[PDB]
């Protein structure tokens, strides 16, 4: 943390953050969500990290070079250590990226190495070559070299993500799936794991072996798993929570802006809220049905009337303000809702649905006051506008993600936030073979458009291809875009270091500090 001249620090440097839900895991290769990544950034540190404003910056690698954007060489700082005192080396990264790639690990983020185009990853994911053929090597203990199959000028931006953080081989190998328990885990970030009580709390304590430990200020941070946004706000206002999770309750938000304006942080956020359609399950394999659902949803009611927190009506998957996005707003988005409603009704009537044999399906969401309120509103809008019936179903976070991967669903509430600020951080998840493709969308036309983006060495041609890829996605109505998020959360006045400037919201508790109060 960089504490400004003249700020008086509190004697007690502890922080309590709400984290939305119980994490899927603390293993960097088994996680895919925001709550998981929130904890992962304090415990495991990769090659690069985001600074306090979100720019990719030195992490374990103090400096790096690239040859033709294909061969990337990372110079690892000599004093990088794990919490047990042992050095962090390039061998740790070699083992770790191989483990990520290995199909036996079944990482939801195995395809992150396809997004970076690391040599031989397609063959490794497919079981054709062993994980040891991945194009990574330790040239020495402090030098990690990555070889890509084609030039990727933005490759280094990918490297702040938890899936490419190192994991300690000896603990993994010795304890298997219990390696992340507090008695066994070993970490290389600014913190170490102290306590982990499922559905209660995660408590982290400063890691004195962290190379940048002298600049860490917070000695202990607790992450809570509260999925009720009302409850989070309540325990924030009671004094227990210093930073809410960034999901705000419809019940209280308007009141909060008038009651504690200075605590209500609202900043840009590269995330999209949408209804994910299971594209492989009838009748959702019919484009007429998917298009009907997309068009009948009334974003103006949802965004400005029911939620009204500053979100923007969405017409794409990639947020339009992503670095490199130059998207074309489709003509349907400019129509009246009435006109969208008629076309929708028309498509379902065309698809064989009637008042007597209507369209009935489930709407799955992760337990939340916000998602439940939005799902009820969407259910009523779809009922009223299109005559479709929906059965709402909530599931806890971890189970919810597994259901989507399983494909044991119809429609699910969903949100995707960028892992790196470039359109492919969204678009790559809709590739036929992506491990993150829970829409189960498979389009050769879409796959080809994205494959072509690294076959040109021109930024405008690349941006035109992303725009066309979004148009392919939209034409197929793979999903139902709802709104682009704003990052809205409450932060006590004594919490220093949170700028709100990072559109990815990659917070590190090592950058924060408690002001005397
Ligand atoms: U004190
Ligand atoms: U650049
Ligand atoms: U940029
Ligand atoms: U269903
Ligand atoms: U509620
Ligand atoms: U460039
Ligand atoms: U105080
Ligand atoms: U105090």
């Amino acid at each position: 943390a960089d504490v400004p001249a003249g700020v008086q620090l509190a004697d007690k440097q502890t922080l309590v953050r709400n984290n939305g839900s119980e994490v899927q895991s603390l293993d960097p290769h088994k996680i895919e969500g925001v709550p998981e990544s929130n904890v992962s950034r304090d415990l495991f540190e990769g090659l690069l990290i985001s600074d306090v404003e979100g720019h990719p910056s030195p992490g374990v690698a103090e400096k790096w070079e690239n040859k033709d954007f294909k061969v990337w060489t990372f110079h690892l700082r000599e004093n990088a250590k794990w919490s047990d005192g042992t050095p962090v080396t390039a061998h740790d990264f070699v083992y770790s990226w191989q483990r990520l790639a290995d199909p036996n690990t079944a990482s939801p983020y195995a395809s992150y190495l396809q997004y970076g185009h690391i040599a031989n990853i397609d063959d490794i994911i497919a079981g054709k070559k062993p994980a040891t053929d991945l194009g990574v090597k330790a040239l020495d203990d402090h030098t990690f070299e990555v070889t890509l199959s084609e030039p990727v000028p933005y490759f280094y931006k990918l490297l702040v993500h938890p899936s490419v953080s190192p994991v300690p081989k000896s603990a993994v190998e010795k304890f298997g799936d219990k390696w992340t328990q507090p008695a066994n885990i070993v970490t290389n970030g600014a913190y170490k794991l102290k306590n982990w009580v499922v559905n209660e709390r995660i408590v982290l304590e400063r890691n004195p072996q962290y190379w940048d430990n002298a600049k860490t200020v917070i000695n202990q941070v607790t992450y809570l798993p509260i999925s009720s946004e009302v409850t989070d706000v309540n325990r924030y206002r009671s004094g227990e929570i210093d930073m809410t999770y960034n999901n705000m309750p419809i019940e209280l938000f308007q009141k909060l802006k008038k009651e504690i304006p200075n605590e209500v942080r609202v900043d840009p956020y590269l995330c999209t809220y949408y209804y994910e359609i299971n594209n492989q399950k009838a009748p959702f394999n019919d484009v007429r049905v998917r298009t009907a659902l997309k068009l009948a949803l009334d974003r103006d009611i949802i965004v400005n009337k029911v939620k009204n927190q500053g979100d923007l009506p969405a017409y794409s998957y990639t947020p339009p303000y992503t670095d490199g996005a130059k998207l074309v707003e489709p003509e349907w988005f400019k129509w009246s809702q009435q006109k969208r409603n008629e076309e929708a009704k028309k498509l379902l009537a065309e698809a064989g649905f009637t008042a007597d044999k209507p369209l009935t399906f489930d709407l799955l969401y992760n337990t939340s006051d916000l998602h439940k309120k939005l799902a009820i509103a969407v259910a009523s809008i779809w009922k009223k506008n299109l005559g479709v019936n929906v059965n709402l179903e909530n599931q806890e976070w971890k189970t919810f993600l597994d259901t989507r991967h399983q494909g044991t669903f119809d429609v699910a509430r969903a949100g995707w936030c960028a892992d790196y600020n470039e359109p492919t951080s969204f678009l790559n998840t809709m590739l036929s073979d992506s491990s993150n493709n829970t829409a189960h969308y498979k389009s050769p036309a879409f796959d080809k458009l994205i494959a072509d983006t690294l076959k040109v060495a021109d930024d405008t041609q690349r941006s035109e291809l992303y725009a066309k890829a979004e148009q392919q996605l939209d034409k197929d109505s793979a999903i139902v875009p709802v709104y682009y998020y704003v990052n809205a959360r409450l932060v006590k006045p004594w919490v220093g270091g949170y700028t709100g400037k990072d559109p990815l919201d990659n917070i590190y508790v090592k950058n924060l500090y408690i002001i005397k109060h």
Side-chain angles (χ1 to χ4, degrees):
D2 291 325
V3 182
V7 340
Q8 259 197 117
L9 292 170
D11 280 359
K12 194 163 158 289
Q13 290 289 325
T14 67
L15 185 72
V16 170
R17 294 189 58 190
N18 188 41
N19 199 38
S21 44
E22 183 56 27
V23 296
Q24 283 169 294
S25 172
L26 299 182
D27 183 333
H29 298 154
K30 309 281 182 176
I31 60 169
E32 75 203 89
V34 172
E36 291 67 24
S37 295
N38 282 346
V39 183
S40 198
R41 288 189 298 284
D42 289 336
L43 299 181
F44 304 97
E45 180 179 77
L47 293 169
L48 280 62
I49 53 172
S50 296
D51 66 6
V52 271
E53 294 183 15
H55 322 285
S57 297
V60 173
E62 55 186 296
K63 48 254 270 158
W64 55 87
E65 302 85 48
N66 81 84
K67 176 43 73 212
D68 308 328
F69 311 116
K70 290 181 54 164
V71 183
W72 295 78
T73 309
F74 297 93
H75 308 281
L76 313 186
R77 72 194 58 253
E78 303 202 328
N79 68 333
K81 289 170 181 159
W82 290 95
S83 56
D84 65 5
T86 67
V88 180
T89 63
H91 306 295
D92 292 311
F93 285 90
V94 171
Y95 166 77
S96 296
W97 291 22
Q98 288 170 350
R99 183 172 183 255
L100 175 60
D102 187 344
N104 288 334
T105 308
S107 173
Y109 266 100
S111 297
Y112 204 67
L113 298 170
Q114 297 171 303
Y115 308 162
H117 296 91
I118 292 79
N120 294 323
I121 185 66
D122 292 353
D123 275 12
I124 293 157
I125 290 172
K128 295 175 184 178
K129 297 187 187 100
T132 47
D133 284 18
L134 187 71
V136 302
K137 68 183 64 173
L139 297 181
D140 66 36
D141 284 351
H142 307 299
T143 311
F144 182 65
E145 185 197 71
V146 179
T147 296
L148 311 187
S149 52
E150 52 183 357
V152 189
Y154 55 91
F155 179 65
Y156 73 94
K157 296 168 59 173
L158 274 58
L159 311 173
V160 305
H161 192 259
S163 71
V164 291
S165 287
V167 304
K169 181 177 169 165
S170 64
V172 166
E173 264 168 9
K174 173 147 172 195
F175 307 99
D177 60 37
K178 285 193 177 181
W179 78 268
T180 57
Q181 279 306 107
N184 304 327
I185 200 181
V186 175
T187 57
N188 79 314
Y191 293 89
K192 302 190 258 189
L193 174 64
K194 193 186 178 166
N195 303 279
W196 182 4
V197 185
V198 170
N199 281 143
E200 208 148 78
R201 70 190 50 249
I202 285 166
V203 181
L204 309 191
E205 63 190 338
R206 176 201 295 267
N207 172 16
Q209 301 298 320
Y210 184 51
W211 70 268
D212 214 15
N213 185 56
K215 312 208 174 166
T216 293
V217 170
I218 301 293
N219 291 314
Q220 179 177 289
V221 51
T222 294
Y223 285 86
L224 302 172
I226 303 160
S227 56
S228 162
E229 299 86 3
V230 172
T231 302
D232 188 0
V233 168
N234 291 335
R235 292 179 191 176
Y236 172 93
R237 299 194 72 184
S238 86
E240 182 194 346
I241 300 182
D242 298 297
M243 299 177 71
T244 57
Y245 180 65
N246 47 350
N247 273 350
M248 287 282 88
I250 285 166
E251 284 89 337
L252 300 182
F253 190 69
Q254 307 312 309
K255 291 149 194 310
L256 295 174
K257 179 38 94 175
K258 306 295 103 197
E259 292 185 63
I260 49 168
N262 294 336
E263 290 178 42
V264 187
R265 314 292 209 80
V266 179
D267 295 290
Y269 197 18
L270 287 166
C271 305
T272 296
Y273 192 116
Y274 57 110
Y275 290 89
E276 172 181 85
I277 292 160
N278 177 359
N279 284 59
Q280 287 167 359
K281 196 212 189 163
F284 310 97
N285 50 350
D286 189 339
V287 68
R288 306 174 293 202
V289 175
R290 317 190 289 274
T291 304
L293 289 176
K294 181 183 75 190
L295 296 178
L297 186 157
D298 183 335
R299 303 148 170 88
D300 185 87
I301 292 174
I302 287 170
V303 174
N304 314 134
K305 305 188 160 55
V306 353
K307 193 171 183 280
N308 198 247
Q309 301 180 352
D311 311 290
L312 275 63
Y315 59 78
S316 58
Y317 184 42
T318 299
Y321 42 110
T322 300
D323 192 335
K326 281 171 167 292
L327 313 184
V328 173
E329 178 181 281
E331 287 301 305
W332 69 255
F333 189 66
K334 300 171 211 191
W335 304 341
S336 62
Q337 185 60 40
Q338 182 208 312
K339 173 172 187 174
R340 278 188 290 278
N341 288 345
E342 269 314 274
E343 171 73 33
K345 292 186 299 211
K346 184 177 91 202
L347 291 160
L348 279 206
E350 281 171 22
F353 294 95
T354 61
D356 177 39
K357 337 184 97 91
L359 170 54
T360 304
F361 61 88
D362 311 304
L363 188 52
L364 172 69
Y365 66 94
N366 54 297
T367 303
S368 155
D369 286 285
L370 173 63
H371 301 317
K372 162 201 289 203
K373 285 188 150 46
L374 291 167
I376 291 166
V378 160
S380 162
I381 289 162
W382 274 342
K383 172 68 187 186
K384 190 217 184 315
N385 286 3
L386 185 53
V388 311
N389 303 300
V390 146
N391 291 121
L392 260 56
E393 302 172 1
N394 65 289
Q395 279 176 9
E396 292 316 301
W397 186 237
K398 185 176 194 185
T399 303
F400 171 68
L401 302 184
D402 177 57
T403 298
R404 291 168 57 196
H405 287 281
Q406 285 167 183
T408 53
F409 78 106
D410 289 332
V411 179
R413 172 266 127 198
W416 186 256
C417 295
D419 298 319
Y420 56 98
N421 193 354
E422 203 281 339
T424 59
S425 192
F426 276 70
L427 290 165
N428 286 341
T429 68
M430 293 291 185
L431 298 173
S432 298
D433 68 332
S434 171
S435 65
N436 296 113
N437 191 341
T438 43
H440 296 268
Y441 172 76
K442 295 205 172 52
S443 171
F446 177 96
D447 292 351
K448 171 53 143 85
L449 293 159
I450 301 305
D452 282 351
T453 68
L454 292 177
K455 275 152 208 58
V456 301
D458 176 327
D459 264 355
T460 311
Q461 304 187 33
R462 207 177 280 131
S463 280
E464 277 175 337
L465 285 163
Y466 300 146
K468 286 160 206 44
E470 286 279 340
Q471 290 175 318
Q472 178 66 56
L473 202 66
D474 183 49
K475 161 174 131 147
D476 299 329
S477 297
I479 59 164
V480 184
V482 179
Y483 58 77
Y484 308 114
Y485 290 63
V486 277
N487 183 2
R489 48 150 50 91
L490 310 183
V491 177
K492 292 286 172 63
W494 53 81
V495 180
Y498 182 70
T499 72
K501 275 281 220 152
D502 179 7
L504 303 203
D505 203 30
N506 276 325
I507 298 321
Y508 296 77
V509 171
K510 72 192 184 56
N511 294 330
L512 306 183
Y513 53 89
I514 305 308
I515 300 169
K516 186 164 298 182
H517 67 282

